[PDB]
Design an enzyme around this catalytic site. Structure first.
Site, short mmCIF file in Angstrom:
data_model
loop_
_atom_site.label_atom_id
_atom_site.label_comp_id
_atom_site.label_asym_id
_atom_site.label_seq_id
_atom_site.Cartn_x
_atom_site.Cartn_y
_atom_site.Cartn_z
N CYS A 192 0.80 -1.21 0.00
CA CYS A 192 0.00 0.00 0.00
C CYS A 192 0.84 1.27 0.00
O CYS A 192 1.58 1.53 0.95
CB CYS A 192 -0.92 0.05 1.22
SG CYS A 192 -1.98 1.51 1.11
N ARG B 69 -0.18 4.64 2.89
CA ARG B 69 -0.21 4.42 4.34
C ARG B 69 0.05 5.66 5.20
O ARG B 69 -0.10 5.59 6.41
CB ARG B 69 0.72 3.26 4.73
CG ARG B 69 0.09 1.91 4.46
CD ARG B 69 1.05 0.78 4.76
NE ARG B 69 2.07 0.59 3.73
CZ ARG B 69 3.22 -0.08 3.92
NH1 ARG B 69 3.49 -0.61 5.13
NH2 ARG B 69 4.09 -0.23 2.91
N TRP C 290 -8.98 6.33 -1.55
CA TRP C 290 -9.16 6.95 -2.86
C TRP C 290 -8.05 6.48 -3.81
O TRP C 290 -7.06 5.90 -3.40
CB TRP C 290 -9.17 8.46 -2.75
CG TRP C 290 -8.00 9.01 -2.03
CD1 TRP C 290 -6.74 9.23 -2.53
CD2 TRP C 290 -7.97 9.44 -0.65
NE1 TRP C 290 -5.93 9.77 -1.55
CE2 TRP C 290 -6.66 9.92 -0.39
CE3 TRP C 290 -8.92 9.47 0.38
CZ2 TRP C 290 -6.27 10.42 0.87
CZ3 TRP C 290 -8.52 9.97 1.67
CH2 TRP C 290 -7.21 10.44 1.88
N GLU D 247 -3.16 3.96 -11.01
CA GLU D 247 -4.02 2.75 -10.98
C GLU D 247 -5.02 2.67 -12.15
O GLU D 247 -5.21 1.59 -12.75
CB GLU D 247 -4.78 2.65 -9.68
CG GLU D 247 -3.90 2.59 -8.45
CD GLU D 247 -4.75 2.42 -7.20
OE1 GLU D 247 -5.17 1.26 -6.93
OE2 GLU D 247 -5.01 3.45 -6.53
C1 HEM Z 1 -6.36 6.47 1.37
C2 HEM Z 1 -6.02 6.28 0.07
C3 HEM Z 1 -5.26 5.09 -0.41
C4 HEM Z 1 -4.37 5.04 -1.43
C5 HEM Z 1 -3.99 6.19 -2.32
C6 HEM Z 1 -3.90 3.70 -1.55
C7 HEM Z 1 -2.98 3.30 -2.51
C8 HEM Z 1 -2.79 1.98 -2.83
C9 HEM Z 1 -2.26 1.51 -4.07
C10 HEM Z 1 -1.86 2.34 -5.29
C11 HEM Z 1 -2.20 0.15 -3.98
C12 HEM Z 1 -1.72 -0.81 -5.07
C13 HEM Z 1 -2.94 -1.52 -5.62
C14 HEM Z 1 -2.83 -2.12 -7.00
O1 HEM Z 1 -1.91 -1.81 -7.79
O2 HEM Z 1 -3.72 -2.93 -7.35
C15 HEM Z 1 -2.69 -0.19 -2.68
C16 HEM Z 1 -2.76 -1.47 -2.21
C17 HEM Z 1 -3.33 -1.76 -0.97
N1 HEM Z 1 -3.81 -0.88 -0.05
FE1 HEM Z 1 -4.04 0.97 -0.27
N2 HEM Z 1 -4.36 2.98 -0.55
C18 HEM Z 1 -5.29 3.71 0.13
C19 HEM Z 1 -6.10 3.32 1.19
C20 HEM Z 1 -6.11 2.02 1.73
C21 HEM Z 1 -6.96 1.56 2.79
C22 HEM Z 1 -8.05 2.37 3.48
C23 HEM Z 1 -6.59 0.25 3.07
C24 HEM Z 1 -7.14 -0.69 4.07
C25 HEM Z 1 -7.69 -0.26 5.22
C26 HEM Z 1 -5.53 -0.08 2.15
C27 HEM Z 1 -4.90 -1.29 2.10
C28 HEM Z 1 -4.29 -1.68 0.92
C29 HEM Z 1 -3.98 -3.10 0.70
C30 HEM Z 1 -4.26 -4.25 1.64
C31 HEM Z 1 -3.37 -3.14 -0.50
C32 HEM Z 1 -2.86 -4.37 -1.24
C33 HEM Z 1 -3.95 -4.79 -2.27
C34 HEM Z 1 -3.72 -6.08 -3.04
O3 HEM Z 1 -2.89 -6.95 -2.68
O4 HEM Z 1 -4.39 -6.32 -4.07
N3 HEM Z 1 -5.22 1.02 1.42
N4 HEM Z 1 -2.98 0.94 -1.96
N1 LIG Z 2 -6.14 3.21 -4.00
C1 LIG Z 2 -6.64 2.06 -3.60
N2 LIG Z 2 -7.24 1.95 -2.40
N3 LIG Z 2 -6.53 1.01 -4.40
C2 LIG Z 2 -7.02 -0.35 -4.13
C3 LIG Z 2 -6.69 -1.17 -5.41
C4 LIG Z 2 -7.56 -0.74 -6.61
C5 LIG Z 2 -7.19 -1.34 -7.98
N4 LIG Z 2 -5.81 -1.00 -8.26
C6 LIG Z 2 -8.01 -0.62 -9.03
O1 LIG Z 2 -7.39 0.08 -9.85
O2 LIG Z 2 -9.26 -0.68 -9.03
#
Ligand code: HEM
Ligand SMILES: NC(=[NH2+])NCCC[C@H](N)C(=O)O
Ligand code: HEM
Ligand SMILES: CC(=O)C1=Nc2c(nc(N)[nH]c2=O)NC1(C)C
Ligand SMILES: CC(=O)C1=Nc2c(nc(N)[nH]c2=O)NC1(C)C
Ligand SMILES: NC(=[NH2+])NCCC[C@H](N)C(=O)O
Lengths: 384, 386
Positions: B90, B93, B262, B267
């Site tokens: 993520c 974070r 968001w 993405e």
């Molecule tokens: C607040 C805005 C957030 C942004 C900008 C963000 C950004 C991202 C991005 C760019 C990825 C890569 C996903 C991909 O390429 O498919 C990701 C993965 C992830 N984020 Fe976030 N995140 C956000 C909020 C959250 C929240 C609220 C949670 C959980 C409470 C979270 C947990 C995760 C997890 C578990 C992954 C790994 C997903 C996977 O393995 O498919 N994130 N995040």
């Molecule tokens: N910014 C996030 N919370 N991303 C969660 C993964 C979403 C996924 N990469 C998509 O494009 O739909």
């Protein structure tokens, strides 16, 4: 413990079984192993030649603690080192390598001559040809033959007492070392450094490269006329000279190698890295981009045009270069050749994926297993 | 340092050591529970306190008499935020402490799941001013079936396999599209048909729920200077809400716990729109830009990809829907690495996933080494329910 290797674009799977190959009796087993590789390469396993070669090697180690490679073995080992190099995207080319045997070299003066001949050969008026020059191996007694420079051709970086750098900030330390051994510096952004060449247990010696040996490309943009005005240029020949070549447990501390550039090395890393020439803002201001906010993507747009200028300029000057799309397509083909030939291919994903447009190239979607096979190019400590 | 992994930044020459990674039947459960209870008591700074010891005793007794145990509300909130904080993939974070946790552990039917999910979507979307949230449905229980959301995200576009082998819509979603149809959904035939939710309550066939369209905020894509770009009729939804991951806390397993933040612009702009096995519009856009698509060395791919990303950012800005560009995101992630170095002695991070899929070395995370490891509480992958 056998790794599964997935391509995420095509949903297909290979298995890498090559990675299972990842004092005096210790050198001996490395040597045997290497000799085995060599006689297998020419389809002569088990031959009288193979068995007798194993014995010479054994006899030489048992009495001297070391041994020496025949020229044809050296040539094989060098190609194999390149082939095995996990960080090289250019390995489709691995079988095509000019090997200059420089093991009969006994002074810094002679290293210089060999180096000039390498540069001349490799440059070939812009039709670049891959080459390696192999200087004498390390010997438990004494100091190493070393080229102190990190590449045969590189630009000076002159520190200012206000901490800023004129020229290439990556070369500040080698620049300083050159001045200390008697070089009178220039004061430009693109001054070619002299060579510091060291023969065993001697002070290194300074040698200026004759300018006509160092082919350079002025950078211009195919449509943006102002780009030429930035006064940028780059050298034709990427020739790494600080790495150690290990073949059969023997170590060649000076063994510079060259190929041709992939465009992002110059276009993205050398010119756009904030700790390198750092021209991103200048270009973006020239392009009249909104610099005040990240969300205009001014960095991404500047970078693309800078990479385009590098390709255009090299192509205009008839100097061999490969763009990151072409280089990665051919690496994919190489990965495929190596699956059929060896059952795998050591690759370092973070180094193979280009520094712009990662997921736009097929390598981004390809899983890769990183491991060390021998013959290898290895890092070694700087000699100062 | 000693044998803690040494972590280098190559842009600035600086070094840290990661000291956090040192913590990387029924007896199994108990020790996971105890470790989590210990973590909860650190976070409120009452380790060794009498209430800490009573909670531990309370938990071993509950496991003793039932084979499982239950979280206090505030433990669930701590655990959910901590799973986000620990998530190596993520990049967002920096936001980890700002998470709305909806406790839905009283839910007892697929109909009630839908109501909770709709509430989540309404709250998180907030008319474009997006708010991070997670809704937690009941944990796995011995002998009883799981709560599952079959969809990979709460909002996803359909993908319809064509007569001629090609796909209309999103190819990533072909399998879930076909399951919806198997389970009674009447498919559309557009490139952007929002899928229905397939929701499963314990030991029951999944049931089908269509999201009212006014709950699904979408952004039509236009380009700030390329006037023709709007004519492509491209769009994307506002809310990224991952629904197929398992939330593990103290050995308890929440099989249905969808979370949303968001988007970061790459993405949509790079992966969802330009991947060859996704919408694959790269060539179409380059043609409209009059680029030379017959040769790699015109950099047509790079040029078109930039303009698509800019279109995404500009359009989200226009619609006043929260979004973050890959520069802002990576800068904020560097700041998170620094905060976590101070708070915890390291930060688990998966370099391949954190570096954006365009303009890699232009972002500071490219030049930052990262150590990847699994800490719990965690978000984990889990098998598809079918
Ligand atoms: C607040 C805005 C957030 C942004 C900008 C963000 C950004 C991202 C991005 C760019 C990825 C890569 C996903 C991909 O390429 O498919 C990701 C993965 C992830 N984020 Fe976030 N995140 C956000 C909020 C959250 C929240 C609220 C949670 C959980 C409470 C979270 C947990 C995760 C997890 C578990 C992954 C790994 C997903 C996977 O393995 O498919 N994130 N995040
Ligand atoms: N910014 C996030 N919370 N991303 C969660 C993964 C979403 C996924 N990469 C998509 O494009 O739909
Ligand atoms: C033929 C044209 C070639 C191309 C286009 C090419 C491409 C590249 C690129 C892009 C890198 C990454 C370098 C960096 O980011 O600094 C690299 C690394 C490397 N290549 Fe090549 N290569 C070529 C030929 C060669 C040859 C002839 C050898 C030696 C026989 C070689 C061995 C290596 C090694 C050892 C590395 C790792 C360098 C390091 O760790 O700093 N390559 N190659
Ligand atoms: C500075 C840094 O982290 C990098 N540096 C490089 C790189 N790849 C290549 N080809 N060259 C690098 O210098 N990737 C990583 C991410 C390892
Ligand atoms: C398909 C694939 O190899 C990738 N996929 C992804 C990725 N990073 C992110 N954020 N998301 C990915 O889907 N990088 C890797 C290289 C792991
Ligand atoms: N294409 C090569 N063989 N490169 C070797 C490394 C050269 C280095 N990346 C440079 O930009 O000068």
């Amino acid at each position: 413990k056998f790794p599964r290797v997935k391509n995420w674009e095509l949903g297909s799977i290979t298995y890498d079984t090559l990675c299972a190959q990842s004092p005096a009796e210790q050198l001996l087993s490395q040597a045997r192993d290497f000799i085995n590789q060599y006689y297998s390469s020419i389809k002569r396993s088990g031959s009288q030649a193979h068995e007798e070669r194993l014995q010479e090697v054994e006899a030489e180690v048992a009495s001297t603690g070391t041994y020496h490679l025949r020229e044809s073995e050296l040539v094989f080992g060098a190609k194999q080192a390149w082939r095995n190099a996990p960080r090289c995207v250019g390995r489709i080319q691995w079988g095509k390598l000019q090997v200059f045997d420089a093991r009969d070299c006994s002074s810094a003066q002679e290293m210089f001559t060999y180096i000039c001949n390498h540069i001349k050969y490799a440059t070939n008026r812009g039709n670049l040809r891959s080459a390696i020059t192999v200087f004498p191996q390390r010997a438990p007694g004494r100091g190493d033959f070393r080229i102190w420079n990190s590449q045969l051709v590189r630009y000076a970086g002159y520190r200012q007492q206000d901490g800023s750098v004129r020229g290439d900030p990556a070369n500040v330390e080698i620049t300083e070392l050159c001045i200390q051994h008697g070089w009178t510096p220039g004061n430009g952004r693109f001054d070619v450094l002299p060579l510091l060449l060291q023969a065993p247990d001697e002070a290194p010696e300074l040698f200026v490269l004759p300018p006509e040996l160092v082919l350079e490309v002025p950078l211009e943009h195919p449509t943006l006329e102002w780009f030429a005005a930035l006064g940028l240029r780059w050298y034709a020949l990427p020739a790494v000279s600080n790495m150690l070549l290990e073949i059969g447990g023997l170590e060649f501390s000076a063994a510079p190698f060259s190929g041709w550039y992939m465009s992002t090395e110059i276009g993205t890393r050398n010119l756009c890295d904030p700790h390198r020439y750092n021209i991103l803002e200048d270009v973006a201001v020239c392009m009249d981009l909104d610099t005040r906010t990240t969300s205009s993507l001014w960095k991404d747009k500047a970078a693309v045009e800078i990479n385009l200028a590098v390709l255009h300029s090299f192509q205009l000057a008839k100097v061999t270069i490969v763009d990151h799309h072409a280089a990665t397509v051919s690496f994919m083909k190489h990965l495929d050749n190596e699956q059929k030939a060896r059952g795998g291919c050591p690759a370092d994903w973070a180094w193979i994926v280009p520094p712009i447009s990662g997921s736009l190239t097929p390598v981004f979607h390809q899983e890769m297993v990183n491991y060390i096979l021998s013959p290898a190019f290895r890092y070694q400590p700087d000699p100062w």
